[PDB]
């Protein structure tokens, strides 16, 4: 089901609403979020992206779903590369 | 999404039959307050000044579907409010300079300083509440039209306190000895002919419903002052040799008309609701003793010796 | 003869008395009064340092809009609509829009001044306020309606307060908050001191500057005229301040104006920076934003701030910085969803644009260049689908502008998040937060459009449902690239 | 530091929106101010005239530079802004700081 | 020359309109107050020279109309910058005329 | 309430009176009336048709001034001074100079009929009159003023009149003859009927349009403010020609309309043509000259004049093929010898503006063409010697401008002369010397400026010494080539 | 060769100034160029009949001075400046016809002061165009552009007073229809006893041609002449009969009265410079005396009858 | 013996004053206004320069004088081609 979250993509200039499904893996969040900023207003590039909480150290990893994270909606997240 | 042409107006004007006026837009429907009921302001809906709206302009009994049709008989905006002022009050103006160079205060009967001084300079206070008052109305009518009307209304109140500042002092040159700018405050606090004045003002401004606010002040107070303070000092300058003060309540009488002229307009607007008939008497019945108290206390007081 | 002005201005402003029918208290209710307890008495020493009186006032308010009038009348035929660039009318239309309507609100503000403050000075200065702002409301619905038949984006220089456009419900969250919706002392020190000697002058004279270098000789005469009643009307707040910190209220002082300052900050870098910085042909750009906010805001407004007795806000460093970033972004946002605008926003971005920006902002273009750098290859290849969004930002809680940051080689952005009663709130900066906390009760049910977005309440929940609710009656209305991307070719 | 420096001045004086005023002004802060350096800063829109510390504006100086009739409560036709508190009368109009920056 | 007397032999009446806020409520008051009459326009930007045949009537009333704000006939002269034609004017309205038919 | 101007206006212009204590003639002598005879009661039925009374004239007057001054206040940063066309820069110069005092020297042929004229309203509206053009002087000195500090040319605004510069000789010989010299009926008929309602249409709103193209929107409001109140006080005149008309003297009436007309045609085509046709940058050229002309003087006033009972001018035809030709040489003239003028005259002659004269002038390249051809390839070769003059120009005796005809491929040139009281006279037309022949009293005895030079009054006698006798002061007073010949590049 | 020179603050006639020219001084001063020749006043033949009449009638005055254009108005208006004020002042007066109408005040008056006003006020109008006609004479005979300017506006106000008087004579018959107001106001003027003073003195003013008696005549000996013995007497008679607008409306006349007067002393104390002047204008002045004394006397007979 | 003419020459566009000497020729006359015309206004050309009184059919001979010539000081002449 429709799980809305606020994404932050690296080299981005803004916060964005994305709307992920609650069983997505954090891989496919990551291109969800890709979907609007790369070749729009962020060069693509090489590398595997990764999803955390906003500002945060921790990684989730790239196979744990939306529901097994602990997110929130509406919680904030960003999209960083390795 | 359609494609559409430009207008020759605003979108909410263009379906006039007619071409609109300077004042059509300038003046029509600009309280967006007004669209959400639940929040009048771009706030918290339960923010303090939302509840105060939502209570003292919302949930008025005083209801008419379409307040932002009502029109100012007059049609005044700003630009022309103020050509006619500045031509009526270059004229009160011009009236002061020449009476002061006949020395028209030397030739008033004897005593009527002191008249002045008990019946005329504390009139300020008075005023200055029409003033706070007309901008309370301003602050909650539903439609700009109606607002607009309190403006110009709370600015020919200040007009009218300024005068009597400008002839309080002017007075008291020629007669020094009568108290004139020195004890206005006590005699609106104590002397018992202002009393019912004050009583009624400061129960006036506690009213805070926007339509009992507008109908007290416009149809029952203001009403009053002209009937039972303006003309009736007119009347006793003239038995005085006072024939600066008649003129002078002459300029102020066309603006206390034109306030009567546009609160009657906005009275026939609302009996368009039958509802509105009803409450409209029940505040005129509920303030007009007050209003009358006030009236016989203030002529009293003048007529005293 | 006639008297002097010093020898009777006492008496017009004697006009405070001791209430017996009803209390103090309940003839200056604290909600909308905001006397913080100070007794009547005290309120008497309030004297307003730019004084008027009813007969010069008219006068001399008739003498200015016959020159304003007198002027848009000569200059009907300049050509200055045919003529000029396209993203000077997208300029006036802006200005219009944003402003309007806003001043007609500041009616109220001056309105509840009038009625409610214990100061007799006040209430007097406050209508000759209540009179200059149904001026400049008249003045930006008259001077802009003649543009109603060239073009429908103008249909919003009233209509825009009435929308639920993103950008209006900005305008009108900040003035609300500051004009319409709080007490009679909030508005004399947020409003007068705060707005009204801090940042109008950016719009009004600043913006004026750049209006004479492009000729538009009725605009800039027209809103210069505007500031001179401004500066009038603004010296309510001073007097306000001193009293305060007089009688041991210079702590509330403090917040009230570093929160007023902040929340105008930000919706001027969104209105007028991206004016000043992009929309403003390059040859008439008189000074950048930054330069513009370093003359008004620091060298001016600070300083001014300074000799009254209060102290540099605790925020200064993050709004130096502020200034530095944020309405590039704001400047990108608003080109790249152009399409929920009410004008056409110009890009700006031309080779000699990048460079001046470069010149005025060192580091540009290795940051939202960037971005443009993606923005343009796609113009270029004609994909013009990856130039306009399918999605919608993300906006703070208090500005109701989205959240944004440095994009490019040394990318940050911060999103300063609240739990607060069971909601989530999200929020642009640290400062946006703190205001929040300052008075939850003011802001803590308040949806922004991207709440309502989600909560149901916008149908379709998609883009073009945003615009139905955004308020847009017709396809010309909607705000596409100020030059049909000419930009893209040089 | 660069904000530190624009923050740390004691300008006052009169911002002269474009019109017939400028000149006289200018002229008038030079002859009424002696002794002070005026500066001037033209944004052709406005001009920036200051001093440090204290600038005054007499009536009777400003109506010979304008070279017309001329009352103080008219400047305010064209006094976009000032910088400095003001103290304004019948005769002058002054601007000035009570501190020193 | 044929030219000149072509130029000559025109019985065109109506007023110059300096350019400023009576240009467009002119041509507009001169189309509703003269029905049945083509009004022409020929605009030099810095005036309008606006005509009819014969007879060309300002009404007071519908100069207000289409002005928008109060007007009196005395104030046109603010904006008259010449006419063609005798004049005929009164509190309610002006009259551009020719005597002769040409 | 107030009582409406109908009801009290005839008690305003009840101001005739039986003298008896002086006779009619002399308190109004016909030296300073010119009645003809006709008796103080006919003067009673003048009916001025543009009316006005003291409240509104304040009024309304007070509201012309206040947007003509604010909007000059509001443009000042607009760079005309200095991002102008030189030649736009020089038209102004032109204007000013030949305009401002003349206008002033208006207020005596109003303040002629206030004293002078047997008609009652005549006397009212010649007061508002002297007002007008009190007005008319004034605002035409204030807004050159600020250029002073610029450029010394602009102090020919105020100084134009007070020198002996050919061309102030020239419009100081009109005005002096049909504004300040003659009595009060020929003031109403020369000054008011002719002038006000024929010629000065175009300099204050043809020019006005171009005005408006070059973007000079403070000159152009200017001046179009000032004919809303010529429009005004300029209905004098018709009243009086209808009067003299019903007592019968149509026939002195069309003689002294015939005179002021081309009296005024000759000064315009000197001032007014090179504007229009050279000076105004193509670009901003509304209408050319000759079209001008034909909307406002042929298809305008000669229609007006035909509607009021009188005929065509006896001399039409001249007047027509004039038109055609003379503001040609006339420009030619002021721009050969630029050194005696007090602007800047621009050549106008790059090959564009050529076309567009061909195009508006068909044959024009064949005939001045050819003159302009001489004077360009000396610019190219720097023969700069042969493109300044080193004589004088012959001058009418009449219109004190210079004697010319159409030069180059059907050249023709023809002077017209007259031996009278031991003097020879030139003029420039037949007209000009039919003018001198229909009063010999009021010009036989001036002499025009080489009258004076060859009589031994300009000394010393030589270009130089005439440059200095015109009043130049400096160098830089004395025109150059608007562009410094970049038109020849 | 031609000196160099580099542009002026100002007009070449001005830049000598000390003080910065101002307004006044830079669209009033030295524009009547027809006193830069004396041989030729204008530009036409030497013995033109203008030409004739200004050598004698200007140039020849016995009343001398080296710099007439040096003259300075006290007050110092133009246009502009004249405009602003009398629209202050006659939407003043404008707004007491207003108002007094309102009130009926012509109905309250003494029984019969409409029989005054119709015999001794209404003529006014005919005394006020011959001070119209006659400053008009003095504007464009006078040496100076700044004198003549002073002329101009009196002139104007002139008729400012004679379009009060007619509106008022209509008003007051609109109250009073059987008084002859607005009806024989001329044949008062051409044969009632009290007019006869004032018409002849009026009649031969007219025809004083030379600039200096014109002036002096004018200036200084009939206009004072009306201020004290018809302006105020007048008010005073109102007074006495209970029209109380009369007083106020004379009051407005009498501040531009003064003015004249002003101007007029300022120009009296300019031609003084020249100490030959004295003579000339005390000769003037006793010369036209006797008509006004017997013009005033004469009116006010008539006046104080009823 | 100066002697002031107003002279027009041919295919110019004004008249002028040039001043000759009694004892002139007319060919001198000729060469005196051409001075003024020629190479300024006027082209050169070919042909010998005649002298007229102003559009008169007749002219005058090559080598007679002012003072033979009859003309009067300040008369009006042509020069022109045969
Ligand atoms: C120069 C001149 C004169 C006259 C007229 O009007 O008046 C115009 C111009
Ligand atoms: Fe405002
Ligand atoms: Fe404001
Ligand atoms: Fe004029
Ligand atoms: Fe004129």
Not at chain 3, 123 to 138: C, K, S, V
Not at chain 3, 432 to 440: A, G, I, L, N, S
Request: glycine residues 6%.
């Amino acid at each position: 089901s429709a799980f809305p979250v606020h994404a932050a993509f690296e080299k981005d200039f803004l916060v964005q609403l994305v709307v992920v499904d609650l069983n997505d893996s954090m891989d496919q969040v990551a291109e969800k979020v890709a979907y609007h900023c790369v070749n729009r207003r962020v060069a693509p590039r090489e590398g595997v992206m990764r999803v955390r909480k906003h500002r945060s150290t921790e990684l989730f990893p790239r196979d744990m779903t939306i529901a097994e994270s602990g997110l929130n909606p509406t919680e904030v997240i960003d999209v960083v590369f390795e | 999404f359609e494609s559409k042409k430009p207008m020759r107006t605003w979108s909410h004007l263009a379906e006039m039959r007619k071409k609109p006026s300077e004042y059509d837009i300038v003046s029509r429907k600009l309280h967006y307050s007004t669209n959400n009921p639940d929040s009048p302001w771009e706030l918290s809906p339960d923010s303090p000044m939302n509840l105060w709206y939502k209570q003292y302009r919302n949930a008025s009994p005083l209801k008419h579907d379409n307040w932002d049709a009502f029109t100012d008989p007059d049609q005044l905006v700003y630009r022309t409010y103020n050509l006619m002022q500045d031509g009526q009050e270059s004229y009160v103006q011009s009236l002061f300079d020449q009476f002061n160079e006949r020395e028209h205060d030397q030739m008033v009967r004897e005593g009527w300083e002191h008249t002045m001084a008990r019946c005329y300079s504390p009139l300020r206070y008075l005023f200055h509440c029409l003033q706070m008052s007309s901008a309370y109305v301003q602050q909650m009518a539903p439609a700009s039209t109606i607002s607009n009307c309190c403006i110009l209304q709370t600015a020919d109140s200040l007009r009218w306190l300024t005068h009597t500042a400008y002839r309080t002092h002017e007075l008291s040159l020629t007669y020094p000895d009568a108290g004139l700018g020195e004890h206005e405050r006590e005699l609106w606090e104590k002397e018992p002919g202002w009393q019912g004045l004050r009583e009624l003002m400061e129960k006036q401004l506690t009213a805070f419903d926007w339509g009992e606010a507008f109908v007290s002040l416009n149809l029952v107070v203001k009403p009053m002052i002209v009937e039972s303070i303006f003309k009736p000092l007119q009347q006793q300058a003239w038995e005085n040799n006072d024939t600066l003060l008649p003129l002078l309540i002459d300029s102020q009488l066309k603006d206390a008309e034109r306030h009567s002229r546009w609160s009657k307009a906005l009275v026939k607007h609302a009996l368009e609701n039958p509802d509105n008939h009803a409450v409209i008497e029940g505040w005129i019945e509920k303030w007009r003793p007050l209003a009358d108290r006030a009236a016989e206390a203030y002529l009293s007081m003048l007529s005293s010796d | 003869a006639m008297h002097p002005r010093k020898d009777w201005y006492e008496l017009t402003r004697a006009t405070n008395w001791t209430p017996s029918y009803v209390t103090e208290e309940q003839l200056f209710p604290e909600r909308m009064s905001g006397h913080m307890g100070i007794p009547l008495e005290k309120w008497e020493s309030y004297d307003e340092p730019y004084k008027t009186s009813y007969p010069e006032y008219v006068s001399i308010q008739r003498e200015k809009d016959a020159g304003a009038y007198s002027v848009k009348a000569a200059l009907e035929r300049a050509k200055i609509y045919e003529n000029s660039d396209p993203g000077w009318i997208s300029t006036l239309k802006s200005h219009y829009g944003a402003i309007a309507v806003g001043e007609y609100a500041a009616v109220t503000g001056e309105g509840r001044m009038a009625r409610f403050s214990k100061a007799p000075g006040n209430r007097n200065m406050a209508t000759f306020g209540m009179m200059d702002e149904l001026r400049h409301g008249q003045l930006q619905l008259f001077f802009p309606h003649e543009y109603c038949k060239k073009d429908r984006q103008f249909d919003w220089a009233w209509r825009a307060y009435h929308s639920n456009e993103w950008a209006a419900i900005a305008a009108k969250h900040f003035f609300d908050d500051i004009i319409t919706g709080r007490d009679a002392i909030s508005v004399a020190i947020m409003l007068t001191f705060s707005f009204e000697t801090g940042f109008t002058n950016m719009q009004f004279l600043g913006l004026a500057a750049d209006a004479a270098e492009a000729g538009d000789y009725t605009f800039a005469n027209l809103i210069s005229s505007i500031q001179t009643d401004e500066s009038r009307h603004a010296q309510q707040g001073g007097p306000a301040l001193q009293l305060l910190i007089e009688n041991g209220k210079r702590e509330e002082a403090q917040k009230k104006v570093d929160m007023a300052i902040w929340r105008a900050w930000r919706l001027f870098a969104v209105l007028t920076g991206p004016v000043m910085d992009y929309y403003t042909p390059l040859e008439d750009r008189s000074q950048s934003f930054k330069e513009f906010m370093y003359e008004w805001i620091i060298g001016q407004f600070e300083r001014s701030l300074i000799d009254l007795g209060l102290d540099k806000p605790w925020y200064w460093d993050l709004f130096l910085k502020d200034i530095d970033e944020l309405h590039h972004s704001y400047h990108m946002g608003v080109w790249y969803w152009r399409t929920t605008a009410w004008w056409n926003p110009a890009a700006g971005v031309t080779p000699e644009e990048r460079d001046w920006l470069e010149e005025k902002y060192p580091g540009w273009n290795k940051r939202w260049g960037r971005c443009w750098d993606v923005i343009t290859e796609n113009v270029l290849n004609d994909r013009m689908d990856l130039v306009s969004p399918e999605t919608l930002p993300s906006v703070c809680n208090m500005s109701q502008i989205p959240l944004v940051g440095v994009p490019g080689d040394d990318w940050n952005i911060e999103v300063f998040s609240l739990e607060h009663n069971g909601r989530l709130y999200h929020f642009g900066s640290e400062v946006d937060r703190w205001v929040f906390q300052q008075d939850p009760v003011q802001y803590q049910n308040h949806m922004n459009i991207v709440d309502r977005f989600l909560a149901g309440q916008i149908q379709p929940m998609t883009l073009e449902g945003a615009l139905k609710y955004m308020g847009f009656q017709s396809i010309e209305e909607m705000g596409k690239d100020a030059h049909d991307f000419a930009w893209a070719d040089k | 530091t660069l904000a530190d420096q624009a923050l740390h001045n004691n300008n006052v004086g009169p911002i002269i929106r474009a019109g017939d005023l400028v000149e006289p002004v200018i002229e008038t802060a030079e002859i009424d101010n002696p002794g002070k350096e005026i500066t001037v800063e033209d944004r052709r829109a406005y001009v920036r005239i200051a001093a440090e510390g204290e600038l005054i504006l007499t009536r009777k100086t400003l109506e010979e530079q304008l070279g017309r009739p001329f009352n103080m409560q008219e400047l305010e036709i064209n006094l976009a802004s000032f910088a400095g508190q003001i103290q304004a009368d019948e005769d002058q109009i002054r601007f000035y700081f009570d501190k020193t920056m």
